[PDB]
Design a protein around this motif. Structure first.
Motif, PDB file in Angstrom:
ATOM      1  N   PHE B  27       0.856  -1.173   0.000  1.00  0.00           N
ATOM      2  CA  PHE B  27       0.000   0.000   0.000  1.00  0.00           C
ATOM      3  C   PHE B  27       0.895   1.226   0.000  1.00  0.00           C
ATOM      4  O   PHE B  27       1.902   1.267   0.716  1.00  0.00           O
ATOM      5  CB  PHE B  27      -0.928   0.022   1.214  1.00  0.00           C
ATOM      6  N   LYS B  28       0.564   2.195  -0.842  1.00  0.00           N
ATOM      7  CA  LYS B  28       1.271   3.464  -0.843  1.00  0.00           C
ATOM      8  C   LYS B  28       0.258   4.597  -0.777  1.00  0.00           C
ATOM      9  O   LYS B  28      -0.720   4.611  -1.532  1.00  0.00           O
ATOM     10  CB  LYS B  28       2.175   3.587  -2.072  1.00  0.00           C
ATOM     11  N   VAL B  29       0.485   5.521   0.136  1.00  0.00           N
ATOM     12  CA  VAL B  29      -0.350   6.704   0.285  1.00  0.00           C
ATOM     13  C   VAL B  29       0.213   7.799  -0.607  1.00  0.00           C
ATOM     14  O   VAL B  29       1.434   7.926  -0.760  1.00  0.00           O
ATOM     15  CB  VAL B  29      -0.419   7.138   1.762  1.00  0.00           C
ATOM     16  N   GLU B  38       5.395   4.623   1.273  1.00  0.00           N
ATOM     17  CA  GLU B  38       5.158   3.247   1.693  1.00  0.00           C
ATOM     18  C   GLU B  38       4.408   3.218   3.019  1.00  0.00           C
ATOM     19  O   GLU B  38       4.768   3.926   3.961  1.00  0.00           O
ATOM     20  CB  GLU B  38       6.491   2.506   1.818  1.00  0.00           C
ATOM     21  N   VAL B  39       3.375   2.379   3.096  1.00  0.00           N
ATOM     22  CA  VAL B  39       2.538   2.274   4.289  1.00  0.00           C
ATOM     23  C   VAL B  39       3.113   1.218   5.222  1.00  0.00           C
ATOM     24  O   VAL B  39       3.390   0.087   4.809  1.00  0.00           O
ATOM     25  CB  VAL B  39       1.084   1.936   3.919  1.00  0.00           C
ATOM     26  N   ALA B  40       3.299   1.596   6.484  1.00  0.00           N
ATOM     27  CA  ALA B  40       3.739   0.691   7.533  1.00  0.00           C
ATOM     28  C   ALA B  40       2.971   1.041   8.799  1.00  0.00           C
ATOM     29  O   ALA B  40       2.218   2.017   8.835  1.00  0.00           O
ATOM     30  CB  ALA B  40       5.252   0.785   7.769  1.00  0.00           C
ATOM     31  N   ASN B  41       3.165   0.240   9.846  1.00  0.00           N
ATOM     32  CA  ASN B  41       2.611   0.597  11.145  1.00  0.00           C
ATOM     33  C   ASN B  41       3.173   1.940  11.590  1.00  0.00           C
ATOM     34  O   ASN B  41       4.394   2.125  11.649  1.00  0.00           O
ATOM     35  CB  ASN B  41       2.906  -0.481  12.188  1.00  0.00           C
ATOM     36  N   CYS B  42       2.273   2.879  11.884  1.00  0.00           N
ATOM     37  CA  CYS B  42       2.643   4.245  12.255  1.00  0.00           C
ATOM     38  C   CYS B  42       1.572   4.787  13.194  1.00  0.00           C
ATOM     39  O   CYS B  42       0.525   5.255  12.741  1.00  0.00           O
ATOM     40  CB  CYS B  42       2.790   5.130  11.026  1.00  0.00           C
ATOM     41  N   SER B  43       1.846   4.723  14.497  1.00  0.00           N
ATOM     42  CA  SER B  43       0.895   5.228  15.481  1.00  0.00           C
ATOM     43  C   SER B  43       0.700   6.738  15.370  1.00  0.00           C
ATOM     44  O   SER B  43      -0.379   7.247  15.694  1.00  0.00           O
ATOM     45  CB  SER B  43       1.366   4.853  16.886  1.00  0.00           C
ATOM     46  N   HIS B  47      -1.782   4.940  10.810  1.00  0.00           N
ATOM     47  CA  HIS B  47      -1.726   3.918   9.769  1.00  0.00           C
ATOM     48  C   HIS B  47      -1.418   2.583  10.429  1.00  0.00           C
ATOM     49  O   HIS B  47      -0.546   2.510  11.301  1.00  0.00           O
ATOM     50  CB  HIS B  47      -0.643   4.213   8.723  1.00  0.00           C
ATOM     51  N   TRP B  48      -2.134   1.532  10.028  1.00  0.00           N
ATOM     52  CA  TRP B  48      -1.901   0.205  10.580  1.00  0.00           C
ATOM     53  C   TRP B  48      -2.123  -0.863   9.519  1.00  0.00           C
ATOM     54  O   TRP B  48      -3.040  -0.753   8.703  1.00  0.00           O
ATOM     55  CB  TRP B  48      -2.802  -0.052  11.794  1.00  0.00           C
ATOM     56  N   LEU B  49      -1.276  -1.895   9.540  1.00  0.00           N
ATOM     57  CA  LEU B  49      -1.353  -3.016   8.605  1.00  0.00           C
ATOM     58  C   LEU B  49      -1.532  -4.329   9.352  1.00  0.00           C
ATOM     59  O   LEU B  49      -0.724  -4.664  10.225  1.00  0.00           O
ATOM     60  CB  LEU B  49      -0.104  -3.099   7.728  1.00  0.00           C
TER      61      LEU B  49
END
Ligand SMILES: *[C@@H]1O[C@H](CO[C@@H]2O[C@@H](C)[C@@H](O)[C@@H](O)[C@@H]2O)[C@@H](O[C@@H]2O[C@H](CO)[C@@H](O)[C@H](O)[C@H]2NC(C)=O)[C@H](O)[C@H]1NC(C)=O
Ligand SMILES: *[C@@H]1O[C@H](CO[C@@H]2O[C@@H](C)[C@@H](O)[C@@H](O)[C@@H]2O)[C@@H](O[C@@H]2O[C@H](CO)[C@@H](O)[C@H](O)[C@H]2NC(C)=O)[C@H](O)[C@H]1NC(C)=O
Lengths: 103, 103
Positions: B27-29, B38-43, B47-49
């Motif tokens: 996933f890319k925002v 690039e989408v990763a876990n980011c509190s 963003h959450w995967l």
């Protein structure tokens, strides 16, 4: 007190903190409105949290990461450290402006 | 093709994708300049995967998360899905605008 210092690298900077008496450390990044953001691993923002061999906490942030601002041709990031007890209460709070390159 | 859909919640939305043939999904925002993150876990960015019980990938994003924009009184987030082979090459890419609440 709390032992801390920061180092300037090529692509980013890292803040090293050493808490005593089994305390923990929470890093919070501040924006220009004074809002406090809890620091966690964030590849998109270039924020990373790691523990050193000496048992210290290391917060590494890229120069182009989230909330790192440019003022007077220097990278500046305002970080507040909360030294806390295992009960969840804050024992002490320190605020530091990481400015790279020094001074 | 690739199976995907998105659901609107109270505080955020989630995108569910189902890749076939052992492929993976990235996933890319996208921001307003077309830059791909690039989408990763980011509190910090909300963003959450996560992977579902059916084996699908779930990207959940808060309405006030990073790069979620407000246009015409609706939350809109532009996400590009890259369906890839284990070799690292992109087999297919789809772009979706998640708009909540629908329509
Ligand atoms: C948070 O992420 C780190 C990994 O971040 C890396 O290092 C940065 C400098 C960045 O630029 C990238 O290279 C990396 O994403 C995790 O760290 C490692 O920790 C694990 C767990 O102990 C260990 O097995 C690995 O060997 C470590 N990596 C290295 C290179 O030594 C760290 O655990 C993450 N923290 C949390 C709380 O999730
Ligand atoms: C990425 O993080 C998730 C946890 O994110 C949570 O759920 C979101 C809805 C958010 O709002 C918060 O509640 C949480 O931070 C990790 O997920 C869990 O995955 C582990 C590993 O399989 C599992 O043991 C836990 O039970 C899961 N949690 C729940 C509630 O079921 C996920 O693993 C992280 N992914 C990566 C790649 O690090």
């Amino acid at each position: 007190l709390l032992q801390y210092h920061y180092d300037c690298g090529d692509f980013g900077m890292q803040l090293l903190a050493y808490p005593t008496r089994g305390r923990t450390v929470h890093f919070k990044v501040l924006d220009e409105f004074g809002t406090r953001f809890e620091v966690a691993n964030c590849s998109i923002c270039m924020h990373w949290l790691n523990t050193g061999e000496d048992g210290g906490l290391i917060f590494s942030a890229g120069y182009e990461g989230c909330h790192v601002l440019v003022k007077d041709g220097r990278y500046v990031l305002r970080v507040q450290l909360e030294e806390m007890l295992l009960s969840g209460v804050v024992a002490a709070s320190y605020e530091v402006q990481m400015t790279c390159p020094r001074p």
